[PDB]
Amino acid sequence: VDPDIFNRDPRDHYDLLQRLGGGTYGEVFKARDKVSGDLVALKMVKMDDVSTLQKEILILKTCRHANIVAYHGSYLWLQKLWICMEFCGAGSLQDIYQVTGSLSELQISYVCREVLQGLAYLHSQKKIHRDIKGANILINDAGEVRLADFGISAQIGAELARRLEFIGTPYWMAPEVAAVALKGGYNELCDIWSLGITAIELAELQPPLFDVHPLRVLFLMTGYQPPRLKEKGKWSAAFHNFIKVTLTKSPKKRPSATKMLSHQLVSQPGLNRGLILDLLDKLK
Amino acid sequence: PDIFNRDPRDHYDLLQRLGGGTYGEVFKARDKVSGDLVALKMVKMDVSTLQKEILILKTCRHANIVAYHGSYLWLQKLWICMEFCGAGSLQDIYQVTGSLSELQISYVCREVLQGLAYLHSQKKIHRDIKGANILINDAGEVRLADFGISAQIGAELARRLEFIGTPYWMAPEVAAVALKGGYNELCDIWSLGITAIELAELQPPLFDVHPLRVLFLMTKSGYQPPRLKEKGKWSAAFHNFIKVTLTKSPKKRPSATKMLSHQLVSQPGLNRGLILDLLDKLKN
Ligand SMILES: CC[C@@H](N)c1cc(OC)cc2c1CN(c1cccc(-c3nncn3C(C)C)n1)C2=O
Ligand SMILES: CC[C@@H](N)c1cc(OC)cc2c1CN(c1cccc(-c3nncn3C(C)C)n1)C2=O
């Protein structure tokens, strides 16, 4: 729900062209603007506590950065909410590497730079993505990089707000319990770790431990040694160092997104959309 | 699975509404066959929370934890049958008798620590230690009650855990909060320290301060753990007990078993006779 919501059928302004797939929740459709012919992405969510959707919309609406999917408005019609966003012609990095195979170090370097620019902006607004992965990093026809799917971020923000509201009397509560109730058990630096895992996923086609049961992975991480790239000789010492510092086990010692932007791997002068246009030609 | 699908009034006569807990209403009831009194908690009946609460009570076999006799499901009402505690809660008692003596508080703290050491040995956390949740029977015995908060937290943790998806990109601190929350069983030791102050002063510290502000006060780096108001009224052993149970850093906070060897609660003259004395004052 939103004060700027369009209380109208989205088919008044758009032609639905094809179903693309789901996100954390909702189904995304490729649509075409009836007036300009411009393509958009429409995420349809069936409708309940509307708190998560209100937060998702607020997150998208208050973002004005090139590395974050552009938000064009939402429609409420027949108990379906449609969130209209920027369309990304090549899909996610996962749609691409599943066909093309491993990305080169330069292509990964450019993607990490673009994601870090988007993360530095999000963290500057006190926002946390919490779901950084290849499937949530979209590529348009121009080789440009966009962060998408704030569903997890919205669920966490709504859950935190719902928790403070029903926490009751805190007079017997221990300080560590009061701290988790107000700020959760972590901060925005979790996004820097997820980006390092994503760099390994782009290089190896899977995140570390993918073949291990999700619950067993949670227990292993909770003596845990941060993952490393498999083939040392395939990558430069700069890429190995990038993985090392992004995957700093202690968040306190983990560098911020702005600090990571001056790391040699992502501050190289030859990084641009042309590296991704090369990958898209390989997909063709 | 062992819930009795029948009306509890077949076996019990409802005598009086006593009051509510975290959820539900507690009634004083009489066994039709033996004339023995029981406590029946009625809850209007997602059943995840009630399932965990019954499981917590059913798997406890310790004298300092209120006895569980079974549950009834009838006419969309769940009745949890438990041991009746003739004197009620310590809050019901101190609201009539006034402040408890140091020896009476020492015995209550010993009994609660024995119950906590047992709960923590089964990987359980009370999370709601306070005077209202410490019950006293006619024999002056001490029983921990109301696992409603513990059940809500356990159900919430299992619900978010089942609907979190792939954790392969999650930072270790995010995986830790997903598996064990942002704190451990040592939160119960802090709550016991606050409860000891509540028994001594009739209110927990900061009782008159807004609940949300109290949360902020504790999160601050300069937060000082509470102390007893009248220093000259209590022994240095009671002051030290408050000092170590209210250790700000949960890492430095002693366990329940370690606290059981503290001078205050290891005194040889601590027995139910101290509460029987308190109950004779109540009889007047
Ligand atoms: C799952 C379909 C995906 N494989 C795919 C394939 C594709 O092929 C041409 C194009 C697109 C997408 C996604 N997408 C988009 C755009 C804007 C927002 C969102 C978004 N907002 N919330 C969740 N999402 C996405 C991340 C689920 N998505 C596209 O433009
Ligand atoms: C609110 C009534 C209280 N003032 C009171 C007054 C009283 O007067 C003689 C007797 C009793 C109680 C409580 N109670 C009992 C017993 C067993 C379990 C539970 C229980 N299980 N889950 C939550 N509870 C309670 C703690 C909320 N309660 C008694 O036997």
Side-chain angles (χ1 to χ4, degrees):
Chain A
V1 192
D2 198 62
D4 319 306
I5 215 105
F6 283 81
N7 287 302
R8 78 185 293 133
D9 192 326
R11 284 166 308 159
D12 286 344
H13 308 323
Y14 300 100
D15 269 328
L16 295 173
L17 305 183
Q18 64 164 176
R19 201 192 80 83
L20 301 169
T24 298
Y25 51 79
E27 299 165 354
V28 186
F29 295 87
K30 175 181 173 173
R32 194 200 302 115
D33 195 317
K34 294 181 160 189
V35 313
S36 58
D38 285 350
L39 298 172
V40 304
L42 276 178
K43 189 168 77 175
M44 183 273 319
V45 180
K46 250 147 164 281
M47 308 168 150
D48 272 24
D49 192 4
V50 310
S51 180
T52 296
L53 273 295
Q54 287 178 289
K55 296 223 163 73
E56 187 196 0
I57 291 176
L58 190 65
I59 296 172
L60 286 161
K61 204 173 64 176
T62 55
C63 281
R64 286 157 208 109
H65 191 278
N67 294 118
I68 300 159
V69 283
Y71 176 72
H72 309 297
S74 300
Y75 299 80
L76 180 57
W77 192 253
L78 284 170
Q79 304 299 333
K80 274 182 180 153
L81 178 74
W82 302 79
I83 308 175
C84 186
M85 291 163 292
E86 172 177 6
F87 175 74
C88 295
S92 70
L93 283 169
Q94 187 177 205
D95 290 322
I96 305 164
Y97 70 62
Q98 290 264 12
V99 175
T100 71
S102 274
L103 271 71
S104 71
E105 185 176 322
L106 286 181
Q107 288 162 342
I108 295 171
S109 300
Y110 167 71
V111 166
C112 293
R113 192 192 68 191
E114 300 298 288
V115 173
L116 278 166
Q117 290 160 187
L119 290 180
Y121 176 84
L122 283 171
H123 302 172
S124 78
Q125 302 194 303
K126 297 298 296 176
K127 290 167 183 179
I128 299 174
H129 193 287
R130 247 297 314 268
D131 200 22
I132 298 295
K133 59 198 194 172
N136 292 151
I137 301 161
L138 311 179
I139 304 296
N140 68 14
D141 285 341
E144 295 159 344
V145 180
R146 315 275 181 256
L147 300 186
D149 209 341
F150 291 93
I152 291 294
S153 190
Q155 286 170 350
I156 287 157
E159 186 201 20
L160 193 75
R162 186 164 52 245
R163 168 172 178 163
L164 268 177
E165 188 186 306
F166 285 89
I167 207 50
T169 55
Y171 310 108
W172 296 258
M173 270 177 211
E176 69 270 19
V177 180
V180 169
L182 283 182
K183 302 194 111 306
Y186 56 95
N187 65 10
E188 68 281 355
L189 298 175
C190 64
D191 285 338
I192 305 300
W193 173 284
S194 307
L195 178 62
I197 299 299
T198 303
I200 297 178
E201 160 199 12
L202 297 178
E204 303 176 0
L205 306 180
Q206 297 289 359
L209 311 182
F210 192 79
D211 50 5
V212 177
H213 195 273
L215 177 63
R216 215 250 281 172
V217 168
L218 282 173
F219 276 102
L220 289 188
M221 291 196 87
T222 307
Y224 185 69
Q225 269 184 123
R228 294 295 177 249
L229 289 157
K230 272 269 160 289
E231 309 186 65
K232 317 301 184 147
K234 204 190 163 183
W235 319 100
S236 77
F239 189 22
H240 289 293
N241 187 260
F242 180 91
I243 294 302
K244 181 183 170 165
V245 302
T246 56
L247 302 181
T248 297
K249 190 171 131 171
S250 170
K252 301 82 187 177
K253 299 182 173 180
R254 197 175 302 123
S256 71
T258 57
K259 189 185 179 312
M260 285 310 306
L261 279 172
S262 60
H263 186 280
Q264 56 183 105
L265 191 78
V266 299
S267 65
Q268 303 182 63
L271 305 178
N272 53 255
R273 68 188 253 230
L275 292 174
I276 299 307
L277 298 177
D278 281 346
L279 185 69
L280 297 193
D281 298 357
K282 186 180 186 182
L283 214 174
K284 272 62 171 182
Chain B
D2 320 306
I3 311 307
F4 307 112
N5 286 296
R6 82 180 79 95
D7 193 331
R9 277 146 298 203
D10 287 345
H11 309 323
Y12 301 100
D13 269 330
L14 295 174
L15 305 183
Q16 180 191 333
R17 183 176 123 90
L18 300 169
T22 296
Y23 52 80
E25 322 171 61
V26 187
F27 296 102
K28 175 180 174 173
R30 195 201 301 116
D31 195 318
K32 294 183 162 188
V33 164
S34 57
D36 283 352
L37 300 171
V38 303
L40 282 173
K41 188 167 72 175
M42 161 271 213
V43 180
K44 293 174 68 275
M45 209 193 84
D46 204 349
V47 199
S48 266
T49 298
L50 283 165
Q51 177 176 3
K52 285 296 199 312
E53 187 195 0
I54 287 177
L55 188 65
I56 296 171
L57 286 161
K58 204 173 61 184
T59 56
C60 280
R61 287 159 206 107
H62 190 277
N64 295 121
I65 300 160
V66 74
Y68 177 71
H69 308 299
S71 302
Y72 300 79
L73 179 61
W74 192 253
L75 282 170
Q76 309 207 338
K77 275 181 228 70
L78 178 76
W79 303 79
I80 308 176
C81 187
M82 290 164 293
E83 166 181 10
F84 175 72
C85 296
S89 83
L90 283 169
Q91 185 178 314
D92 295 326
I93 304 166
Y94 70 61
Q95 276 172 178
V96 173
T97 196
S99 273
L100 269 71
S101 73
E102 184 178 322
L103 284 183
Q104 288 163 343
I105 295 170
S106 299
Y107 166 72
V108 167
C109 289
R110 192 191 67 192
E111 299 300 288
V112 171
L113 278 166
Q114 291 160 187
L116 290 180
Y118 176 84
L119 282 169
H120 302 172
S121 79
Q122 299 195 305
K123 299 302 126 187
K124 290 168 182 177
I125 298 174
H126 194 285
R127 248 298 312 268
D128 202 21
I129 298 297
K130 61 198 279 191
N133 292 151
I134 300 160
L135 312 179
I136 304 294
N137 69 13
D138 286 338
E141 295 158 345
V142 179
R143 314 276 182 256
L144 298 185
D146 210 341
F147 290 93
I149 291 293
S150 190
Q152 284 171 350
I153 286 159
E156 185 200 25
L157 195 72
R159 182 164 53 246
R160 159 206 174 181
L161 190 69
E162 184 193 0
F163 286 92
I164 207 44
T166 59
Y168 310 110
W169 293 261
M170 298 192 175
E173 71 270 21
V174 180
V177 301
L179 282 184
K180 287 110 162 63
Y183 54 87
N184 63 11
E185 68 281 357
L186 299 172
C187 63
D188 284 339
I189 305 298
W190 173 283
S191 304
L192 177 61
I194 298 298
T195 302
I197 296 178
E198 173 201 2
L199 297 178
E201 302 176 0
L202 308 179
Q203 297 288 355
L206 309 184
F207 83 99
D208 52 359
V209 176
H210 196 273
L212 188 67
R213 176 187 165 182
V214 174
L215 295 177
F216 301 124
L217 297 189
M218 302 189 194
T219 301
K220 275 193 75 169
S221 63
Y223 186 66
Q224 29 179 114
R227 282 104 210 208
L228 288 157
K229 269 159 46 68
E230 313 184 65
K231 316 302 184 147
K233 203 190 163 183
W234 318 102
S235 76
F238 190 23
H239 289 294
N240 188 261
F241 179 91
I242 293 303
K243 181 183 168 173
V244 304
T245 56
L246 301 182
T247 295
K248 185 173 133 163
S249 175
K251 301 82 187 178
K252 314 172 185 178
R253 197 175 301 123
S255 68
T257 60
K258 187 185 177 314
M259 285 311 305
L260 281 171
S261 59
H262 186 280
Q263 179 174 233
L264 190 78
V265 299
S266 65
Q267 306 178 62
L270 296 187
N271 49 62
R272 59 184 194 178
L274 303 178
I275 305 303
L276 294 186
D277 282 348
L278 189 68
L279 302 185
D280 294 343
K281 270 196 64 187
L282 267 197
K283 289 212 219 96
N284 297 1

